[PDB]
Amino acid sequence: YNIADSNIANLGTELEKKVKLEASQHEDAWKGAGKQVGVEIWRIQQFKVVPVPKKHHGSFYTGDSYIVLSTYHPKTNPDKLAYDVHFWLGAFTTQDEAGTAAYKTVELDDYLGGLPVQYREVQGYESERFLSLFPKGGLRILDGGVETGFHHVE
């Protein structure tokens, strides 16, 4: 059409990125994230981004969705940080959990200046990069999960 006359004229702009960067400042889970090499994990629990304790990293409930931030030193500079952000969707996760995980992955990407590369990791379809995150025997799938945040309309 005529993009400039339309409701998509401001998509792709610095302004869009500025507004979304500001929104990402309002999520407590990102404070302090991505500050050293390692793996940080959160689980969606009734729309909220909830940290997973380090002792459980690599264990994922099949009924749930998660965000996994892998911070590493890039080849270009051994003293700087780069990021892969994986969102892991269990075989039995509900639509609210997977949609929140997707949205919040974009938000964490925004928070980190766009630098993270995103990976969608469905249970049984995990990428080679995701399989490489956990030490041998570290990746384990657990039965069950937390309850959906949706109210079911009868």
């Binding site: 507004v19 929104a23 990402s24 974009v106 309309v153």
Partner: protein
């Protein structure tokens, strides 16, 4: 505080509360007035009194063309259907991409000045559908009653240069079915009869995998025919109209449009994107909207995109079972997130900035 989510379709209002898994109010986006020229009826009740009313849709091809009647739709949604006081609820609205900017300016003005909402946002429909599918990268084909649109999205950002839109969707298919049914000697002409034919279309139409083969099957015997009982009790029979009607999506020349069909708009949109992301788009074609509900449409799309794409390209069509409501559901999810609501226009911001603020906050 609970947000309202209202997906104002050209054909159907889908409305409800953020955090619910489905819209609690789904009804025709119509105002009816006496066919013989209180004074008007809205939604289901207009449909119920169709026998004596002329029905009008305030939205045509995704754009509000009768603002007075649209205000009646919104008033009905808040006060008669959901039975809420709009001044108590932040409200998420939706729009097709490539609408003229004035459409959302006036949406914003009416929501704040007439309905006194405390905050609001206008989202692009395809983005909500992609999140409803649990993805940040993919290409959405959304087709409702008024608009068919393609939006490729990468890492959560829609790619505006690659967005495609066709003002050909379910209402045009209903009108075409009305036309071709005259070949059998049937006459469907009035606004009330349009709604009957819409029902025939929804119940009996399908997309043929091979259109020319299907035409030959329909002439060889009656194996594809179905009957349908009209509200007056007359029982009609339809045959190849079942699949000629939605064939228009693939061949818009059936209604005199020179446009590319939906398989070609999808391919063309992918081809406007950077080469290195195209494999991810081809593998993540997400369908949303009522006009994507024809039996056979996903298989036909798979076949047609395969014929256009490089011979080794891995292609996948995702057709969620609740895709009549995927836009709404994505809105319910996002409107449940405090950070998404942080971007909403507040009543104070509107008071100070006016309608232009919508372009600076809603992406």
């Amino acid at each position: 505080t609970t947000a309202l989510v209202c997906d104002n379709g050209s054909g159907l209002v889908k409305a409800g509360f953020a955090g619910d898994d489905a819209p609690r109010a789904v009804f025709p986006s119509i105002v009816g007035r006496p066919r013989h020229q209180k004074d008007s009826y809205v939604g289901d009740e207009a449909q119920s009194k169709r026998g004596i009313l002329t029905l009008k849709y305030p939205i045509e091809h995704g754009i509000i063309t009768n603002w007075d009647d649209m205000e009646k739709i919104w008033h009905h949604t808040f006060y008669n259907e959901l039975r809420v006081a709009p001044e108590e609820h932040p409200t998420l609205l939706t729009e097709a991409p490539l609408n003229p900017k004035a459409n959302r300016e006036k949406m914003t003005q009416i929501m704040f000045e007439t309905f006194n909402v405390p905050a609001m946002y206008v989202a692009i429909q395809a983005v909500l559908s992609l999140y409803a599918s649990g993805r940040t990268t993919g290409i959405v084909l959304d087709s409702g009653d008024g608009v068919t649109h393609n939006v490729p999205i990468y890492e959560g950002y829609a790619l505006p240069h690659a967005i495609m839109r066709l003002d050909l969707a379910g209402r045009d298919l209903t009108d075409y079915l009305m036309k071709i049914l005259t070949e059998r000697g049937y006459s469907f002409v009035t606004t009330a009869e349009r709604e009957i034919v819409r029902d025939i279309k929804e119940k009996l139409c399908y997309v043929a995998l091979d259109f020319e083969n299907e035409m030959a099957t329909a002439a060889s015997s009656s194996s594809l025919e179905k009957s349908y009982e009209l509200p007056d009790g007359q029982v009609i029979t339809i045959g190849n109209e079942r699949f000629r009607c939605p064939e228009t999506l693939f061949q818009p020349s059936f209604i005199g449009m020179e446009s590319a069909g939906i398989h070609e708009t999808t391919y063309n949109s992918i081809m406007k994107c950077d080469i290195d992301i195209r494999k991810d788009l081809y593998a993540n074609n997400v369908m949303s909207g009522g006009t994507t509900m024809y039996p056979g449409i996903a298989d036909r799309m798979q076949k047609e995109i395969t014929a256009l794409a490089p011979s080794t390209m891995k292609i996948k069509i995702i057709a969620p079972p609740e895709r009549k409501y995927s836009v709404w559901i994505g809105g319910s999810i996002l409107a449940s997130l405090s950070t998404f609501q942080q971007m909403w226009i507040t009543k104070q911001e509107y008071d100070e900035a006016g309608p232009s603020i919508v372009h600076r906050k809603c992406f």
